[PDB]
Amino acid sequence: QQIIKIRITLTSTKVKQLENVSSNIVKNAEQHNLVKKGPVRLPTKVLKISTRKTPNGEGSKTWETYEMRIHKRYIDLEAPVQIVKRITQITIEPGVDVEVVVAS
Amino acid sequence: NEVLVLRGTLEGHNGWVTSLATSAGQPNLLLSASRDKTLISWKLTGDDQKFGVPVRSFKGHSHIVQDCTLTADGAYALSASWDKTLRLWDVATGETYQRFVGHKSDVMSVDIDKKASMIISGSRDKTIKVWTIKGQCLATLLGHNDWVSQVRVVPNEKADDDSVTIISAGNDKMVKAWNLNQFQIEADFIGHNSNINTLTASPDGTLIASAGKDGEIMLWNLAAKKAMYTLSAQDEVFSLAFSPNRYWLAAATATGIKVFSLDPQYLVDDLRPEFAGYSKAAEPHAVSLAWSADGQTLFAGYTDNVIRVWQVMTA
Amino acid sequence: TPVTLAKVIKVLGRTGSRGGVTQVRVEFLEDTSRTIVRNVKGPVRENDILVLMESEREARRLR
Amino acid sequence: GVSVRDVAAQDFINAYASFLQRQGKLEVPGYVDIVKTSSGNEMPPQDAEGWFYKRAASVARHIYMRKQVGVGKLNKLYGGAKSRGVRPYKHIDASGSINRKVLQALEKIGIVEISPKGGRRISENGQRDLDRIAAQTLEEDE
Amino acid sequence: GRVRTKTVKRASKALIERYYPKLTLDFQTNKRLCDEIATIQSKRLRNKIAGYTTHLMKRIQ
Amino acid sequence: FTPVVLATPIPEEVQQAQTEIKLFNKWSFEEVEVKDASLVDYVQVAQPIFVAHTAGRYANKRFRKAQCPIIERLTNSLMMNGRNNGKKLKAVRIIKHTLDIINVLTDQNPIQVVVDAITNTGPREDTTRVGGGGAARRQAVDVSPLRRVNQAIALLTIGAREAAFRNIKTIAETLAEELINAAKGSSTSYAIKKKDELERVAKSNR
Amino acid sequence: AVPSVQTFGKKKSATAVAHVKAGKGLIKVNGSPITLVEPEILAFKVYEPLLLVGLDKFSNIDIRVRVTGGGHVSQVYAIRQAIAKGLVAYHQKYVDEQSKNELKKAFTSYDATLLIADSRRPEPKKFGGKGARSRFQKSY
């Protein structure tokens, strides 16, 4: 029955798939009822690459500021080798990264 | 005879007075309502200056209060507001027993039966919802298609069976009286010419008023359910008031207070005094009224930010 | 050196090239009903007590 | 009852300075009159003296105020900018040396100590020796 | 400035026709209402329609 | 007369001084007034600064320059000479000095002789550049009194500034060497030796 | 019990934390009471609010004000707001309600910050020129 205290660490470029996954997350895990926290929500990094517009000195001095704003996002979750694996497999998706930095 | 004389007020709030409440068990223990997100507790000491000590604010919602119903005991004040609640306040103190949440559109009400239990509240989602003295619903009634405006308690001397009765309101232009225990069906008020923005009740179980955006005040019985005394009061009342045991009406018609006198059928006494630097369309027109619980003290309330309580005394 | 303190009533219209001049009536505070129309230089209002040792030049409207 | 805090930021300075001038124990390292502290000061300290006994109450009040720190910390603190001259004025980090040696001399009596995580923490004495001498600098104010 | 616009006026001037009666000047009771009626873009746009309307019922009377 | 006995003795010297009383508890702003009719209305005597700093939203509203405490449109000027530019705390550690070197030299109510270096130091009969052509006249017209006091502080700062300037005198001893001699004004100062020098370029053009 | 109520402070950058409890006298700022001000010319900034009112009231009311953010004069209003702020958070949750109206008509009079923190922003910078509304040199 070996217990493990996992920690769930997410990141994307859309606030709309992403929020989706700690609604699914923390209600595809309170179905499971797990001992967990609520979607912690980490300082928004947010890169601004100044660049001039022109192809050639010429031409006024005419500049840009395009950037990726991630929303970093993490979680928690206990549960054995069986019911963290059935959870990590499920949320499954476009835009997004899931780590399972495990705490054995 | 009764020359009604116009006295010292109790001024205090920054927004706009929008209810007010008859204390209903310690008639001092005034307890007043708001717009700017509190409830200034005013004593009636009474002793003259201040007519009578603004001793607990209570702060907030996030948004505007449309009500503040006292309990059957009268030291536990029940909120509402435009951010979709309740928040039961302690008259004595600054506190939130039970956030009652759940509505969608802006509470318009609040009231409590004769034992302090199966509470109600209207809405704009166009219901109703009971929330017992816990954030919990008995059920969520849906017979109306509208903004159901206001609901009241009635204060029963056929000594109460126990399967009781309450009421409601109003752009569908109708009332409807919901057993407060198992929301059955009883009669409605057909007819009117636009918004039912209020109603009221008897101080024994056999009187009521509704009212006006048309002009007319269409009167009751509940224990006859038959349509009555049809008056004609031009602008609107926003803000109705039974004396408790006299037979005097009080409602704030813009313009009067029209005391109409619900026995015979007369205009006794219109209070539009006092007034200083206005362009009409500035009067600073009411929005809540009451009759001392024990029934004199009219606690006449107005926009502005000055309550103006105005009792009836001698000829 | 005789100082006649004159009160501004009616601020009139803007003048000068660079808007350095308002026009100005004035009510003589210290001989009310006299109501002469001089000029002044400032960012004015009605009630700017105004100061003249030159009683009186009455002035005409400057490009 | 009687604090190091309850008392000012240069009376404790000059009244631990004339305590650690008149202690003799304090030792006094061999590049501590000449040598320029800081290299943008031209002027070393205008005392030449027991700045070392005025840097022995600074350092020390400075520790205790916080947890721990030093020598590449009292390195960002004591200096200021630079005199670059012509070149728009510029920070310069002192010389770890003198207070890398009062921090190993304070180590001696029982005033300053080495905080586990490590580096300078005042001991358990030490503090005893700053709450004795913040109450002897409170009565030149009283 | 503070100078009103078409999209806005011509949205209140269409409205003011039907809904003079629900009609008001506490404009914070129109604001709500002015959604149940129009099918508006925005929150800002909407707060500038009813602003105008209240400039109708404050002068109509 | 009642010392609070609170550990933290927060003064019984700056408790009897500013409990009994309002105002900066060195100078008492308490039976000190203004003696002219024109520069009342447009020179605050004082709303209480108990120090000589308000954020200061004084130029949005076209008027409030008025509402502005005199003492803090002064520290305001000094604000220069460019190198200091920015430094207010050097400019109040300097005029919190000035008010002691007027009290000390005269023996006056020095916050009043601060005010009498206002109305006296104001140019009334003033000129303007009529455009006008290649050459014309500076139609001579008496500023509102608004503008006047704008100048009455502006003037005073451009002549007690050269006086420290290769000078043994630390603006604290030239500012109070200007206001005592500028109210008695005299002409040992710089206003009553330009103020008069603008009356005196106008009295002709006029 | 503890009776504690309590607040923050905010002027252009940082915060304080007025833990306004029930004790005997104290007013600790930064681990250093207010007699011990910090940039000691402005010193009179915080000294107005103890007296702007009875040094009477604050004997009861104990403020351990921790002070972080925001160069020295920033926070000066941040710790001013917060002793008043709560002046009415004590005089709101605890000491009545007209004691917030007797106050705020005292405390509203300097009609300043004190109560309501500053609004003004630093303007963003741009391209080309250096503090804010500056445009680079000109040519011909």
Add this chain to the structure above:
RNA sequence: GCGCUACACUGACGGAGCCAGCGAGUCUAACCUUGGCCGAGAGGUCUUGGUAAUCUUGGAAACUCCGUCGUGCUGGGGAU
């Protein structure tokens, strides 16, 4: 043409108070360095941590402090 310090006592010198924010950073090798010593100093170094909200790194200057300098091209100026 773009720029730095200064013509002062509203400053220059000094103790004694003594305060942020944008960064960065060593790997296949020497980037940050304290601490504790040696140097008047500039520094030297032993040794230490740190692939960094984890170390140097919580102590930057205008300033309040307490004054010397006293109208002396100085005790402004800092060229050569």
Add this chain to the structure above:
RNA sequence: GUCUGCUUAAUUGCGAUAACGAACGAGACCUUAACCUACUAAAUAGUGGUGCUAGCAUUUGCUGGUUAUCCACUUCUUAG
């Protein structure tokens, strides 16, 4: 159509109109600075309580030191 006029940071909009209704620009949108005593978590953020504890008071108090003594917190500080 894209205009006399009044309107704006703006062909930005009411209105006048053999002219009706659309595209690009602008604006909408993206970056960051502000706010959330509601959520979600933090021995790489800090609280009290807790000892261990080092001083002044002795009046219970006041001033500390402690990357674990433990925990409990999450205003703070980070940030979804």
